[PDB]
């Protein structure tokens, strides 16, 4: 039933899951008015829903109109994002269809229970992982298309580019959420160490550069050192002799 460090490894077995994460579907802007005065103002948001065995990423955009009319919409969004999910499934053959749905908010398990009614056989699941998917809206090709929206769509990824032709989805996992954790910690660091070669560009059809096997394996310890310095600045900690499942729990989540 909850998702933990400790049962974490079955996102990667032959029954398919996907995580959903709402954190990212109402979002306001702060802007000057024509008075001079200050205001929030909604912008495009987006329901991230992800397969973590293969890496596709339906990312439905939220566009700013479906507020109109509307009030309390962080109560609202929950409900919205439940009816996005289980128009998604539904539009699935039962082939493709989900044996489990985990939200990384307890408050969406309600909403999303309500509208699976019509799905028996697809178990609704939290976790005790605080998993950094908001960050999502860092990567900047989802930023872009987010806010480029004009309508409501749904707009198709790999999350993992072509990393999974190399390694193994466990291994793509723990890559995606270390540098989602990063991004999440300290997006302005992340970016630089990312964004410093341009040698190494990032494929059209991808989200991520084009980093070698070599170039990874450097880069996911420069994202290990901004999450430790930045926790180890926290927590008055000594980040080594830090066990890897430590290391493991902070990236994650979890305790």
Known sequence: ??????????????????????????????????????????????????????????????????????????????????????????SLPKEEQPKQIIVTRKAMLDPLEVHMLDFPNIAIRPTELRLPFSAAMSIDKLSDVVMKATEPQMVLFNIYDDWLDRISSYTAFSRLTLLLRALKTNEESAKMILLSDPTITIKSYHLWPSFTDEQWITIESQMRDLILTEYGRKYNVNISALTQTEIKDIILGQN
Request: proline residues 2%; aromatic residues 12%; glycine residues 4%.
């Open 1 to 90: 039933p909850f998702l933990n460090s400790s049962n974490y490894a079955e996102l990667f077995n032959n029954d398919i899951k996907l995580f959903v994460d709402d954190t990212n579907v109402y979002r306001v802007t702060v802007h000057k008015t024509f008075e001079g005065n200050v205001a929030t103002k909604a912008i495009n948001g987006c329901i991230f829903t992800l397969n973590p065995k293969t890496g596709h990423l339906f990312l439905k955009i939220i566009h700013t109109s479906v507020w109109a009319g509307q009030k309390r919409l962080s109560q609202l969004a929950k409900w919205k994002t439940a009816e996005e999910v289980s128009a998604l499934v539904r």
